[PDB]
Amino acid sequence: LPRITALRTIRLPERPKLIWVEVETEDGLTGLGETFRGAQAVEAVLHEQTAPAIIGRAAENITSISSELLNPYVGFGSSSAEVRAASAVDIALWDLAGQRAGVPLHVALGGAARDRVPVYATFMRDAGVLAESLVAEGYAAMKIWPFDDFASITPHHISLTDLKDGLEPFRKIRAAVGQRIEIMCELHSLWGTHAAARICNALADYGVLWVEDPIAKMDNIPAVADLRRQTRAPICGGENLAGTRRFHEMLCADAIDFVMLDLTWCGGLSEGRKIAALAETHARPLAPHXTGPVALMAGLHLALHAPTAIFQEVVRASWYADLVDHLPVIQEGIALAPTRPGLGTALLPHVRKIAGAVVRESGKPR
Amino acid sequence: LPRITALRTIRLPERPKLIWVEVETEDGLTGLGETFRGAQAVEAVLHEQTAPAIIGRAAENITSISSELLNPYVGFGSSSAEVRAASAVDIALWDLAGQRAGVPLHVALGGAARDRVPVYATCAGYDFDAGVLAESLVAEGYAAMKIWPFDDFASITPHHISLTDLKDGLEPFRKIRAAVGQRIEIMCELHSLWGTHAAARICNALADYGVLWVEDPIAKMDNIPAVADLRRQTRAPICGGENLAGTRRFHEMLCADAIDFVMLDLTWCGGLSEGRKIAALAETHARPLAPHXTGPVALMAGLHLALHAPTAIFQEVVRASLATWYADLVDHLPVIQEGIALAPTRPGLGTALLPHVRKIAGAVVRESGKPR
Amino acid sequence: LPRITALRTIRLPERPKLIWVEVETEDGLTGLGETFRGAQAVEAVLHEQTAPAIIGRAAENITSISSELLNPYVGFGSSSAEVRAASAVDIALWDLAGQRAGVPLHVALGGAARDRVPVYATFMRDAGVLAESLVAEGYAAMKIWPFDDFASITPHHISLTDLKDGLEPFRKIRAAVGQRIEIMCELHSLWGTHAAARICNALADYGVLWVEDPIAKMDNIPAVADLRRQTRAPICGGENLAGTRRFHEMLCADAIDFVMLDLTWCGGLSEGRKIAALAETHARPLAPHXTGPVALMAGLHLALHAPTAIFQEVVRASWYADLVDHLPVIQEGIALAPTRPGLGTALLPHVRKIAGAVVRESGKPR
Amino acid sequence: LPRITALRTIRLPERPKLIWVEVETEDGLTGLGETFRGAQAVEAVLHEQTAPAIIGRAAENITSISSELLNPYVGFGSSSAEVRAASAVDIALWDLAGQRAGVPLHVALGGAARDRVPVYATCAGYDFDAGVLAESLVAEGYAAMKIWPFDDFASITPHHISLTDLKDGLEPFRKIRAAVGQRIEIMCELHSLWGTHAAARICNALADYGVLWVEDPIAKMDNIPAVADLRRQTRAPICGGENLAGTRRFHEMLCADAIDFVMLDLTWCGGLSEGRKIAALAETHARPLAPHXTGPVALMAGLHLALHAPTAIFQEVVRASLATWYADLVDHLPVIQEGIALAPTRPGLGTALLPHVRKIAGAVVRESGKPR
Amino acid sequence: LPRITALRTIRLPERPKLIWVEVETEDGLTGLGETFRGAQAVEAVLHEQTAPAIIGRAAENITSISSELLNPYVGFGSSSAEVRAASAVDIALWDLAGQRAGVPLHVALGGAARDRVPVYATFMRDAGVLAESLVAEGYAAMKIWPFDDFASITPHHISLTDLKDGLEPFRKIRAAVGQRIEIMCELHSLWGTHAAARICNALADYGVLWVEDPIAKMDNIPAVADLRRQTRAPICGGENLAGTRRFHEMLCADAIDFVMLDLTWCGGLSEGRKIAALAETHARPLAPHXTGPVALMAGLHLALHAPTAIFQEVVRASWYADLVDHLPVIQEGIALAPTRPGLGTALLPHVRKIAGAVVRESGKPR
DSSP states (O other), rough: BBBEEEEEEEETTTTEEEEEEEETTSSOOOOEEEEEEESHHHHHIOOOOOOOHHHSSSSOOHHHHHHHTTTTTHHHHHHHHHHHHHHHHHHHHHHHHHHHHHHHHHHHTOOSSEEEEEEEEEOOOOOHHHHHHHHTTTTTTEEEEETTTGTTOOTTOOOHHHHHHHHHHHHHHHHTTTTSEEEOOOOOOOOOOHHHHHHHHHTTGGTOSEEEOOOOOOOOOHHHHHHHHHHHEEEOOOOOSSSSSHHHHHHHHOOOSSSEEEEETTTOHHHHHHHHHHHHHHHEEEEOSSSSHHHHHHHHHHHHHHHTOEEEEOOSSOOGGTTTTOOOBOOOSSSOOSSBBBBOOOOOOGGGGGGOOOOEEOOOOO | OOOOEEEEEEEEETTTEEEEEEEETTTTTTEEEEEEEEEHHHHIIIIIIHHHHTTTBBTTTTTHHHHHHTOOSOOSSSSSSHHHHHHHHHHHHHHHHHHHSSBBHHHHHTOOSSEEEEEEEOOOOOTOOHHHHHHHHHHHHHHHHHHHHHTHHHTTTTTOHHHHHHHHHHHHHHHHHHHTTTEEEEEEOOOOOHHHHHHHHHHHGGGGGTTTTEEESSSSSTTTHHHHHHHHHHHOOOEETOOOOSSOOOOOOOOTTTOSSSOOOTTTSSSSSHHHHHHHHHHHOOOOOOOOSSSSSHHHHHHHHHHHOBBBOOOEEOOOOOOHHHHHHOOOOOEEETTTEEEEOBBBBBBOOOOGGGGSOOOEEEEEEEOO | BBBEEEEEEEETEEEEEEEEEEEEETTOOOOOOOOOOSHHHHHHIIIIIIIHTTTTTTTOHHHHHHHHHTOOOSTTTTHHHHHHHHHHHHHHHHHHHHHTTTTTTHHHHHHHSSSSSEEOOOOOOOOHHHHHHHHHOOOOOEEEOOTTGGTTTTTTTTOHHHHHHHHHHHHHHHHHHHHHHHEEEEOOOOOOOHHHHHHHHHTTGTTTEEEEBBOTTOOOOOHHHHHHHHHHHOOEEEEOSSSSSHHHHHHHTTSSSSEOTTTTSSOOOOHHHHHHHHHHHHHEEEEOSSSSSSHHHHHHHHHOOTBBBBEEEOOOOGGGGBSSSSOBBBBSSEEEEEOBBTTTOOOOOGGSSOOOEEEEEEEEEO | OOOOEEEEEEETTTTTEEEEEEEETTSEEEEEEEEOOOOHHHIIIIIIHHHHHHTBBBBHHHHHHHHHTOOSSSOOOSSSSSHHHHHHHHHHHHHHHHHHHTBBBHHHHTTTOOEEEEEEEEOOOOOHHHHHHHHHHHHHOOSEEEEOOOHOOOTTTTTTTOHHHHHHHOOOOHHHHHHHTSEEEEEEEEEBBHHHHHHHHHHHHHGGGGSEEEEOOOOTTOOHHHHHHHHHOOOOEEEOTOOOOSHHHHHHHTTTTOOOEEEEEEEEESHHHHHHHHEEEHHHHHOEEEEOOOHHHHHHHHHHHHHHOTOOEEEEEEETTTTTHHHHBBBBOOOOEEEEEEOSSSSSOOBBBOGGGGGGGTTTHHHHHHHH | OOOEEEEEEEEEEEEEEEEEEEEEEEEEEEEEEEESSSSHHHHHHIIIHHHHHHHBBBBTTTHHHHHHOOSSSSSOOOOOOHHHHHHHHHHHHHHHHHHHHTHHHHHHOOOOOOSSEEEEEEOOOOOHHHHHHHHHTTTTTHHHHHHHGGGGGTTTTHHHHHHHHHHHHHHHHHHHHHHEEEEEOOOOOOOOOOHHHHHHTTTTGGSSSEOOOOOOOOTOHHHHHHHHHHOOOOOEEEEOOOOOOHHHHHHHHTTOOOOOOOOHHHHHHHHHHHHHHHHHHTTTEEEEEOHHHHHHHHHHHHHHHHHHHHOOOOOOOOOGGTTTTTOOBOOOEEEEEOOBBEEEEEEEGGGGSSTTTEEEEOOOOO
C-alpha cells in the first residue's frame, strides 16, 4: 500500500551522541526514530546502506524490514552502528503503523497490558537527601553508580577501602529513608568477575533491587551466570545487547533476574517485542532503558505492552521539550499510557533550522 | 617513546566497499590497515571515535589499544562497524611494530610456525563448468577449491530447498569429481544463508562428494546451538567464523563442538591481536584454521596469521597466475607459486599503498591529528 | 636470521633448587632463563634433549620452538622436568627478542596493559605486627600459610583445635590493621576435600582475598569445583600447573576465582601469554608467582602485559642482587614497568666463577 | 623390618633411552625396575630426589612410597621425568615384595585373573609388505597386529592430511585384508601425532578395514574433549593412555566416554601400584585393557599387570620366534608360544640383570646410600 | 600352589546376627572371615553356592575369586546375602595371604599408609557427660543417633517439637565440652528428603563433622546429592552399600563428603581396596564401619592401607574377647598398626563347642 519515499537524518552539534531519523511514506505521513552513540557512523549506515534497501518498500512490512536490517553480512547480533540504524528505522516504522491505524504505538503492537507503569529515577554527595526528594515526589525506585570511578584504576580488582567508599551512598539512603525506596546499583559493564562478586556480596545488607550490568562485558554469559550462582545477588542485564539470540542465551543460562533493553540499541520495537515474549516465557521481569526523547517514548510503549514489564527508566534533568512536541505524562512516579496515535511525539518544525544542524536525505523528500 | 600522531582513511569510488587506514607515528613511519563493507560507517568511526582515543598514545601498546577499541560501550562482540575500524587500526599498529623491529609481521607476533602455507584460490583479476576449473586449478598446484552453487536458491526462501534445486546445486560437485577425482579438496561455501532444515539437507546430500568442509551453513553463525545440532545430526565437516568477531564467539563455537575448522577474517575479527588469541583457542582445541581473503591488506594480514598460527592449514587467496587489481594499489603481493604462499621476508606488513593512491580521481581522503 | 649457537646451564651449590640457562645467538647476544626444583633433572633435559633440538634453529621462531619443547612424547601437560626446561628456554628466547628489537620484554609480547602493578608480600609469631610494617611500607596485600604443619599429621583431616591455631594469625591481622591490607591464605596443595572445605568455611569471617591451592593436587578440577560451589570461598589456582589445557579446564569448570602461574613452571612466557588470554576470555583476574630473580622479572613482564593481571608476588627477604645486574623497581608496594630492552636483567660476570658452580655447555659458546 | 639401603642406576651407551634401577634392602635382596626416554633426567631425579626420600624407609610400604613419589610439588599428573623415576622404583619395590613372599609379582598384587594372556607383536630382534607379515604372524598364532603407516605424513603437517597421503597410508590395511581376511585383528597406531580433522579423516577412512582400535589419534591424549568428540562423530574404536600417567587422567578419559580400550605403560603411568588402580578404573567402567611394551623390565611388568587386571585382553610384545637383545641383559624372558604369554611361576618380577651388565663398556653406574 | 580345601561356618545362638567363616587350605592354614545380618541366608549361600565354586581353587587368586563371588547372576551390586557371603570369604582369603607371606594383612594389600589411625566411639540421657569421659579417654570424635525413634512415627516428616528433642544431645555436648570432640550425627538411612534436610539444616549451629546416611536408602544418589547441594551439610555415605559401582556413582555425583564402608558388607577387602582407590582419586576421606571382632580387624587393616582414611569406628562396650585371641591395641583414642601376620586374629579353640553352636562344613576339613 503506502511505500517508503525518503529517509532523513538530523544531528545537532549540541548533542553529538544523538541522531534522529525520519521516514517519509507516500501518503504524506512521516515516522520518527532515534538512536544514541556513534552518530556519524549511524548516519553513514542509514544513507549508504539502509536507504537503498528500504526506499520503495511497502512500509507496512515492518517485521520483514526489521529481519533484513538486523541481519547484515557483518555486525549482526550486537548493538553495532548497523543495528542502531536498524533500531532507529524500526521505531519510525511502528510510529507510522500507529499513525495509519489511528492508535497508540503499544496498541499497534497488540495492545496495552497495563494503562500505566511505575518509573524509576536516573548521589556522590549525599544520596540520603536525594532519596528524600525522590520518595517525596513518589518515585518507587532510584538508580546510582558510585563504583564507576574505581574501575579506571583497574577493572579487575577493587580495594577494600575503595569498596567502603562506594557503599556509603547505600548506607546514607537506608539511614535516611529505610525501605521507602528501592535501590539499584549500576555497574556499567565495568568489572571483571572478582571485583563484580566483591561488590555484589558487599551490597547484600543494603537490600538492592538489582545490580545492573556487573561484568565487562555482558555478552559474557558464563561469567554472569557464575556470579549469580555464587553470590545469589539480583542481576539485571541487557541495556547494551541486541537481538533475541543474546537475550535468549542469558535467560536460558539463568544468568539474570531482570531483563533490561534499550529500544534504540536492541534492534527496535519489533525486536524488543520478541525479547518481551522471551522474558514472558521465562517469567522474568523487564524494564526499558532511557538518551533522547524518542528512546524514552519507544521504551514506554514497550513497557505498556510487555506482559512482564515492571518499570520504565526516566530522567529528571532532561531539554527534550526543545526538540519534540510531546513527552509522556508522569504523575507521582507513574507514567501513564499515551493516547495519541503512533509514537505520540514528533520533532518540532524548527529543529532542522537549528545552528549547525547536519541534515541528510535519501530518496525523494516531500 | 614513539607516539601516534595522525590517522588517515582513503576510499576509492571504484572499490566502494573498501577503506584503507594509515597510522602515522612521531618517528616518521606509517602503518597500513584496511577493512571491508560499510566503508563510510567505518570512516566515521575512525574519525569521530577512534582518532581521539589513539592519538597521543604510544604506538607500542598494541594489545592495550586493541582491548579498548574492541570494547566500545555499544557494538562489541560482533563484526560491527566499530570492530571493523578497530581491526584496521590493529593491523596498522602491528605493521608499525614490524617496521620498528625490522621483522616481518608474523615474527613480531612471536614467530613463524611454518615458512609457507598451502592456499586455495577463490577470486582472480579485476572484477571481484567447474570440471574445467578443477583441471586447471590442479594443473597450477592448488590442493583445494571453494565453490558456492547453492546461494541463489536461498533468495527463493532461506528455510527450505526443493529436491530439484538440491540436485542442481550438487551438479558442480559431480563435475569436479568426474574431471579430477580425489586430486583436489572441495569446500562448499554456504555464506550463512540457510535455516536448520535446508542446511541439514544440503550437508547430508554432499556426503558422497567427500567435501573437505561445509562453510557457514547457518543464518547466522552466532547461532551456535543450531550449528552444534547440525554437526551432530549430519556429522558433516563444518567451517565457521568468517564474519564473526572477538574471542567470546569463537570460544563458544569451539566449546560447543559446533565446528571442525576455524575461519576468520583479520579485518573483521578484531584484527591480528585478536586473531592471535583466536589461533590460541584453536590450538588448545586442536582444531585447524584458515584465514579468509577483499583487499590486498586483508590478504597480507591473513598470510602473516596463517604462518604464525600453530594450527593453520590453508589461506584463501587471489589466483596467482592471473593479474589482479591488488597490484594497482600496493607495492608488494605475496609470492604464491604452485598452491603455496611463501613467508614474507620484508619488515612489517610487507606491503604499502603506492604513492599515486591518495591522488586517484574522486578519492575521499580524511585526516585526524597532525599529518606530516 | 640469527640462529641459536650455544646453550649453557649454571647451578650453584648455595642454591640447589635453582638453575639458570643462557642461550647464545650468532649475533653476539645471550638470553637468560631460569627454573626451580629438580635442577639436575632440568640440566639433564636441557643438554641431552633440548640442545640438539634447538641449536641451529632461528631464534625468532619463539612460539614454534615453545610448541615443540612443550610437546615431548612423555611429560607434556604438567610442570615436569621436561616442561621446566622448556619454560627456562622460552624466557631466554623472549629476552633475546626484546634485545634484538630494543624494547622491554612485555612490549615485545604486544605491549603494556599498564605502566605499573601492585605487589603483594610473601607470621606464626605475631602476624598483626607483620601486617603493620607491610601496611606502612604500602603493600596492598600479604600472603601467609599457617596451616601447612597440620597436613603432616594427616592431609585428609584437620582437628577443630588445630584449625583454631591456624586461624589466630588472621584474627591478629584484622585486630591490628582491620581492612587496611588484603589477606591471602596459602594452602600449598596440601589438603583433601574435607580439610580444605573446613579451612575455607572457617576463613569466612576474616574476609580473605583468596585461598590458594586448597586441594592435593590442583589437577583435581572436579574436587576444586565442588569446594568452590559448596563453600563459595574465593579460590586461587595454578602455581604448579603447566600448559593451556589444565588452565582452560579449571576456568571452564568455574573451579577458580583467580589464575596464578609461574612463568618458569607453566611453559614459559609464550605459554603464559596464552594463559593470560584464557583468563581475559573468562574475565578472571591473574597474578604471577615468584624462586629466583629471573622468575620474578619474567612474571612482572607478564603482569604488565596480561589484560587481567592485578598483582605480582614479590619477596622481601631476597641475595638476588648478588646474581644479576638489575631487579625491578618497587615503590610503595608498586612495581614499575621496566624500560631496559629484553628481560632487563642479566647474570653478573662473576657468577660462573663462584665456588663449586656447575656450568655445562652445548653447541659452540662464544 | 627390611629397610631400603641403596639405590643404583645403570645406563648403557648402546641403549641411550633406557635406564635400569636397582633397589637394595637390608635382607640381602635387590629389586629391579626400569624406565624409558630422558634417561639422564630420570637418573638425576633418582639420585638428587628419590634416593634421599626412600632410603631408610621400610620396603614393604609400597603404595605409601608410590603416593609420595607420584606427588612431587612439580611434575605430577603426567609421564614426567619425576613420574617415570617413581614408576621404575615402584616396579623394583613390587619385585621385592614378590621375592620376600616367594610369589610371582602378579600374585603379590592380589592374584592372577588368568593363567595366560593373548599377545600382539610389534617389535623384534636387536634394532628397536604388510600382507606377507600378516601371513607369518597368523602362521605363528598371533591374534592381533599393530602398524602405524600414517606417521610420516604428520611431518608435512599434523593438522591436515591430503586424500592422496590418506590413500597411501591405507594401502597396508588393504594388503593385510587381501592376504589373510579376518584371521588377524588390526590395530592402527597414530602415536598422538594428529589434530582433530586429520584424525577424524583417518578414523573414518579405516571403517572398511574393520580395525580393532585406532590408538592415540590426538596430539596429545590429555585433550579429552577432542578425543570424546572424535569418538562421538566417527564412532571409531579408540585406544588411549600409553603415554599418560596417574589415575586422574585415566579416570577423566573413561568418564568422558573418550575411549573404547585402555592402554598403559607400566614404566610411565606411575608403576604397578598405579597401574593396579588404573585396571580397577577400567573394570568399573567394564572397559578392556592392554599393557604397552621398550626394555625387558617393562615387558615383564606389563605381563604381570595383564595377568592380574580383570579386563586385560592383550599384551604388546617382542616377537618370540626371533631372538632379541632383551636376552643379552636379563636372565629370564616370558614364555610366549603361539600368540599367548604364559603366567610366570618364579618369585618376584621373575627376571634380573645379568652379572656382566654393570661392567659393560661405558656403562654409567651411579649409586646412593650403602651398596653391599 | 595351596588350594582351598574346606569351608566352615559357625553361628552362635547368643549372637544371632553374626556368622564366622573359616577357609582351610591344603598347607594346614585356616583363614577367618565374618559377616553380619541374615546369618542363616549367608550360611546357606556359603554352603549351597560358594563352596562348590571355590573348593579346589588356588587360594592365592584372591581378586579373581572376589570378581566371581561378587558377580552372581542375581543379587550383585548390593549388600545382599550373596555379597555378604563373598565379603566374608574374601577376608579369610586375605588373612591367608598374610599368613603365607608372614606379614600383616594391610602390608599384604600393598603396605601401611600410616602406622596408626584415630578411632571414634560408638546418649539420650546426658550426652554432655558421655562427651566428658570420651574426651578424657582421648577420643577425637563420637557418634550419636538421637533422631531414630522419630522415624517410626513417619520417615517422611519430623515435627518441630520432635526436631528440638533430637537436638538436645548436641546442645549438651557443646555446652559440656565445646570444640574438644567432633560430633557425628547418624541418621541410619531412615528419612525422606524433607525430614533429612530439616535435620541437616538444624544441625548447622552444632558444627557436626558429618551427617551419616540421611536418606532412605543411600542407593538414592540424586536425593542425597540434592540434599548436599541445598543444605551444604557434610554428608557421610556407604555403610550398607556394596561394590565399586554404587560408590563410584556417589562420588561422581558429589553426593558425599566422606566415604564409609563395612568390609563384611561391601564385598570384602579386595573390593574395599578398590573403593579406597576411588576415594583417593576423588580426594575424599574414608572411615571403615564396625558388628563382630573380625569386621573390626578387617576395617582397621583397610584404615591403615587406605591413602585417605581418617578414622576407624570402634565400640567401647564390646565380649569380642571371648571369641577371638587378639583385638587391636587402642591407646588414647588411637588404634595402632597390627604386627602379627595375616588378619592378626583367630577364633579361640573352644568356640565350636559352645552350647548350641551351629557348625557346618563343606569339602574335606583337616
